[PDB]
């Protein structure tokens, strides 16, 4: 609820502009927020909306688009590298800190649903952390893991008023 | 309940359930003067039998045992409906397959009607009924002949046939209301075989009305307050399962009627789509009523004590 | 009615003779609720002396269960085979009141059974005495209870009886109020549709009559 209150605040600022062009940081926030909501079509159209002159002026905008290109191809092992290729200032940094978590949870849901057996090499590149999940996942979440072959096995875990509305409509 | 249910019952004034019990003399005179049943022939399609009349007819039919019994039924008409408000027995003697009403019934009819007019019975004779002890509810040849004779001169008249043996052996009343066609008039055009099997040879000579029953508010209250097995059977009636097959049959002939309406509307003058829509609304309303009963039972019993 | 026989023979006896009658009560088949027997000179003075052990046993048979007997086995006296069967039967009754689908795991742990077959023999025998009714289910390992007797009551559950019944009365009142409101709303919709239908018919006839000479 609190997050939604900030979402609609940035929406209208771009529409009203003294000359049809808003300040650079407003443009960057909308593009990054589109990535967080997985709305890829509007994110692509926003990039096409920015004039070329301002686009080349600020390379910070280009850093958002390079990450957006990877997530547009659903390249899970590649988005984690582009999100760290550039350095984002603290004004836009917290938004990226939430997009990374959203991508991380998205891979977890996709693997558990679309895969019955997945190589540990490929699964680590999906979830994003090939650091400490190798040993922690065996005993905590209960997923049986087999070494050498490296196969992971995901496992699955008031009306009365409505009715009288129907009759009052049908009989009349 | 206050204002909500104060005027919702209003025992001082007759409810909408007791409306049918009021006799309008002027309306009766107007409808009998107009004679709307002379132009058409499938005019009357519904027969509304009161609770007391049905009970008296059933008890009379069973009292004869294996011998036929007969009597008259008072009532009126309203639109396409024949309403039977009462019934009264005749002092006849008959055998297992023949009842004649020779000479004591004809005096009893007039004398009983005269006596009933004295104590405020404004209805006139509307039909005659007889029992078929053990061979279904149908009109025999002589039954069809006497029905024609009654209908040709006393124009409003419906023949009711009861079956005490099947009523007792099945647990539900076996009754049928019928009307007949004029002499040598209207020969309209797996069905014929079963039709002659369960009806008589004169299947096309008469048609069967749709029989429904009604009751007043005082009758309803007295019946539901008679035994404890009537509100227990309401809180556990379990509709949508007692009569699911009837619902499927209604959906089937609804589909047939919809096909006929689609055929008609693409190009006698009856507007079949309206009747199909009315039938669909009716059956959907029974289905939703059953679901409402189930929801009320679930909220009353299941949602108590965690 | 069987308990009434032992009650009258226990109206005056006291001491060792009275305590012997208590053991016979727990051994007589068909005596499963010891309600009237527990409101006699027993509770008045039996908490002192060597006979207080039997008083605790009678309280266990009326309100307690089999697990409540293992915990205080040292204090309570020994029980014959006939008495133990009655105690195990009442344990099934207590579980049936709480839940109407008793798993086999609960019954095995509470009754200290080890073989599934001998547990089912005990359950079937309990059905024969008609304290409980139901049907066993081997595939799901459940006992589906359809009806069970009401065990003994004390003056600390009557408030719970009032609470459950009062909640049911408020449940009926809520349903009744809902039915009235829906009836009124449906009738208002019928009147609104009828009024609009007659309003259009009234307007069309007015313009028709005007030009008819």
UniProtKB/Swiss-Prot annotation, chain A:
KW Membrane (keyword) present: no
Principal cellular location given in the protein's record: cytoplasm
Superkingdom, natural source: Eukaryota
Keywords for this protein: Cytoplasm, Nucleus, Phosphoprotein, Signalosome
Location(s) in or outside the cell: Cytoplasm; Nucleus
PCI domain sequence ranges: 1-157
Cleavable signal peptide: none
Protein family: Belongs to the CSN8 family.
Assembly behavior: Component of the CSN complex, composed of COPS1/GPS1, COPS2, COPS3, COPS4, COPS5, COPS6, COPS7 (COPS7A or COPS7B), COPS8 and COPS9 isoform 1. In the complex, it probably interacts directly with COPS3, COPS4 and COPS7 (COPS7A or COPS7B).
Function: Component of the COP9 signalosome complex (CSN), a complex involved in various cellular and developmental processes. The CSN complex is an essential regulator of the ubiquitin (Ubl) conjugation pathway by mediating the deneddylation of the cullin subunits of SCF-type E3 ligase complexes, leading to decrease the Ubl ligase activity of SCF-type complexes such as SCF, CSA or DDB2. The complex is also involved in phosphorylation of p53/TP53, c-jun/JUN, IkappaBalpha/NFKBIA, ITPK1 and IRF8/ICSBP, possibly via its association with CK2 and PKD kinases.
This protein's name: COP9 signalosome complex subunit 8
Taxon lineage: Eukaryota, Metazoa, Chordata, Craniata, Vertebrata
Gene behind this protein: COPS8
Swiss-Prot record, chain B:
Transmembrane annotation, as ranges: none
E.C. number(s) listed in UniProt: 3.4.-.-
Entry keywords, A to Z: Acetylation, Cytoplasm, Cytoplasmic vesicle, Hydrolase, Metal-binding, Metalloprotease, Nucleus, Protease, Signalosome, Synapse, Zinc
Pfam families, A to Z: CSN5_C, JAB
Protein's cellular compartments: Cytoplasm, Cytosol; Nucleus; Cytoplasm, Perinuclear region; Cytoplasmic vesicle, Secretory vesicle, Synaptic vesicle
Enzymatic class: hydrolase
Keyword Cytoplasm: yes
Protease is among the record's keywords: yes
Cofactor: a divalent metal cation
Domain of life of the source: Eukaryota
GO MF annotations in UniProt: deNEDDylase activity; enzyme binding; macrophage migration inhibitory factor binding; metal ion binding; metal-dependent deubiquitinase activity; metallopeptidase activity; transcription coactivator activity; translation initiation factor activity
Span of the annotated motif JAMM motif: 130-143
Residues reported to bind Zn(2+): 130, 132, 143
CDD domains linked to this entry: MPN_RPN11_CSN5
A GO biological-process term: regulation of IRE1-mediated unfolded protein response
Domain MPN: 47-184
GO cellular component: chromatin; COP9 signalosome; cytoplasm; cytosol; eukaryotic translation initiation factor 3 complex; nucleoplasm; nucleus; perinuclear region of cytoplasm
Domain text: The JAMM motif is essential for the protease activity of the CSN complex resulting in deneddylation of cullins. It constitutes the catalytic center of the complex.
Subunit structure of this chain's protein: Component of the CSN complex, composed of COPS1/GPS1, COPS2, COPS3, COPS4, COPS5, COPS6, COPS7 (COPS7A or COPS7B), COPS8 and COPS9 isoform 1. In the complex, it probably interacts directly with COPS1, COPS2, COPS4, COPS6 and COPS7 (COPS7A or COPS7B) and COPS9 isoform 1. Interacts with COPS9 isoform 2. The CSN complex interacts with the BRISC complex. Also exists as monomeric form. Interacts with TP53, MIF, JUN, UCHL1, NCOA1, HIF1A, CDKN1B, BCL3, GFER, PGR, LHCGR, SMAD4, SMAD7, ID1, ID3, ITGB2 and TOP2A. Part of a complex consisting of RANBP9, Ran, DYRK1B and COPS5. Interacts with IFIT3.
PANTHER family registered for this protein in UniProt: EUKARYOTIC TRANSLATION INITIATION FACTOR 3 -RELATED
Official protein name in the record: COP9 signalosome complex subunit 5
Organism per entry: Homo sapiens
Swiss-Prot record, chain C:
Protein's UniProt name: COP9 signalosome complex subunit 7b
Keyword Transcription regulation: no
Residue ranges annotated for the PCI domain, each copy included: 1-150
Function description: Component of the COP9 signalosome complex (CSN), a complex involved in various cellular and developmental processes. The CSN complex is an essential regulator of the ubiquitin (Ubl) conjugation pathway by mediating the deneddylation of the cullin subunits of SCF-type E3 ligase complexes, leading to decrease the Ubl ligase activity of SCF-type complexes such as SCF, CSA or DDB2. The complex is also involved in phosphorylation of p53/TP53, JUN, I-kappa-B-alpha/NFKBIA, ITPK1 and IRF8/ICSBP, possibly via its association with CK2 and PKD kinases.
Residues shown, of full length: 10 to 222 of 264
Subunit organization: Component of the CSN complex, composed of COPS1/GPS1, COPS2, COPS3, COPS4, COPS5, COPS6, COPS7 (COPS7A or COPS7B), COPS8 and COPS9 isoform 1. In the complex, it probably interacts directly with COPS1, COPS2, COPS4, COPS5, COPS6 and COPS8. Interacts with EIF3S6.
Keywords assigned: Acetylation, Coiled coil, Cytoplasm, Host-virus interaction, Nucleus, Phosphoprotein, Signalosome
Stated family: Belongs to the CSN7/EIF3M family. CSN7 subfamily.
Main localization (coarse): cytoplasm
GO cellular component annotations of the record: COP9 signalosome; cytoplasm; cytosol; nucleoplasm; nucleus
GO terms under biological process: COP9 signalosome assembly; protein deneddylation; regulation of protein neddylation
């Amino acid at each position: 609820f609190s997050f939604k209150k900030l979402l609609d605040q940035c929406e209208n600022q771009e529409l009203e502009a003294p000359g049809g062009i808003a300040t650079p940081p407003v443009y960057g926030q909308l593009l990054a927020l589109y990535l967080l909501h997985n709305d890829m079509n509007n994110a692509r159209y926003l990039w096409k909306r920015i004039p070329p002159a301002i686009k080349s002026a600020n390379s910070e905008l280009g850093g958002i688009w390079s990450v957006g290109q990877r997530i547009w191809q659903r390249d899970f092992p590649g988005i984690y590298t582009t999100i760290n290729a550039h350095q984002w200032s603290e004004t836009v940094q917290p938004i990226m800190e939430a997009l990374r978590d959203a991508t991380r949870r998205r891979a977890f849901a996709l693997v558990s649903q679309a895969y019955t057996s997945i190589i540990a090499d490929d699964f680590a590149a999906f979830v994003g952390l090939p650091v400490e999940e190798a040993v922690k996942g065996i005993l905590e979440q209960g997923w049986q893991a087999d070494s050498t072959t490296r196969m992971v096995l995901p496992r699955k875990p008031q009306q009365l008023a409505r009715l009288t509305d129907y009759v009052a409509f049908l009989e009349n | 309940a206050q204002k909500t249910w104060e005027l919702a019952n209003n025992m001082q004034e007759a409810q909408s359930i007791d409306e049918i019990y009021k006799y309008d003399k002027k309306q009766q005179q107007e409808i009998l003067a107009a004679k709307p049943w002379t132009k058409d022939h499938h005019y009357f399609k519904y027969c509304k039998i009161s609770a007391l009349a049905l009970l008296k007819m059933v008890m009379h039919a069973r009292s004869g045992g294996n011998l036929a019994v007969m009597g008259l039924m008072l009532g009126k008409v309203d639109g396409e409906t024949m309403i039977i408000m009462d019934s009264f027995a005749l002092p006849v003697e008959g055998t297992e397959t023949r009842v004649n009403a020779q000479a004591a019934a004809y005096e009893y009819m007039a004398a009983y009607i005269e006596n009933a007019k004295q104590v405020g019975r404004l209805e006139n004779a509307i039909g005659w009924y007889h029992s078929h002890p053990g061979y279904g509810c149908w009109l025999s040849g002589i039954n069809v002949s006497t029905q024609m004779l009654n209908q040709q001169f006393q124009e409003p008249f419906v023949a009711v046939v009861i079956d005490p043996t099947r009523t007792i052996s099945a647990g539900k009343v076996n009754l049928g209301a019928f009307r007949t066609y004029p002499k040598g008039y209207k020969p309209p055009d797996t069905i014929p075989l079963n039709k002659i099997e369960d009806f008589g040879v004169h299947c096309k000579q008469y048609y069967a009305l749709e029989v429904s029953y009604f009751k007043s508010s005082l009758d309803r209250k007295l019946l539901e307050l008679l035994w404890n097995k009537y509100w227990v059977n309401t809180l556990s009636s379990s509709s949508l399962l007692t009569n699911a097959d009837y619902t499927t049959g209604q959906v089937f002939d609804l589909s047939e009627k919809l096909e006929q309406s689609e055929a008609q509307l693409g190009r006698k003058s009856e507007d079949k789509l309206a009747k199909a829509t009315r039938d669909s609304c009716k059956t959907t309303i029974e289905a939703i009523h059953g679901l409402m009963s189930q929801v009320i039972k679930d909220k009353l019993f299941n949602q108590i004590n965690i | 009615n069987l308990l009434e026989q032992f009650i009258l023979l226990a109206k005056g006896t006291s001491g060792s003779a009275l305590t012997a009658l208590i053991s016979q009560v727990l051994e007589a088949p068909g005596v499963y609720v010891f309600g009237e027997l527990l409101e006699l000179a027993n509770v008045q003075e039996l908490a002192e002396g060597a006979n207080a052990a039997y008083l605790q046993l009678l309280n266990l048979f009326a309100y307690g269960t089999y697990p409540d007997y293992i915990a205080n086995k040292e204090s309570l006296p020994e029980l014959s085979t006939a008495q133990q069967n009655k105690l195990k039967h009442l344990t099934i009754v207590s579980l049936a009141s709480r839940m109407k689908c008793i798993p086999y795991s609960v019954l095995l742990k509470d009754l200290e059974m080890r073989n599934l077959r001998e547990l089912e023999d005990l359950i079937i025998e309990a059905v024969y005495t008609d304290i409980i009714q139901g049907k066993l289910d081997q595939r799901n390992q459940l006992l589906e209870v359809d009806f069970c007797i009401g065990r003994d009551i004390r003056k600390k559950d009557i408030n719970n009886i009032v609470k459950t019944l009062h909640e049911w009365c408020d449940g009926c009142e809520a349903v009744l109020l809902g039915i009235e409101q829906q009836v009124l709303r449906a009738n208002q919709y019928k009147e609104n549709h009828n009024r609009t239908q007659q309003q259009v018919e009234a307007e069309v006839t007015n313009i028709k009559k005007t030009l008819k000479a």
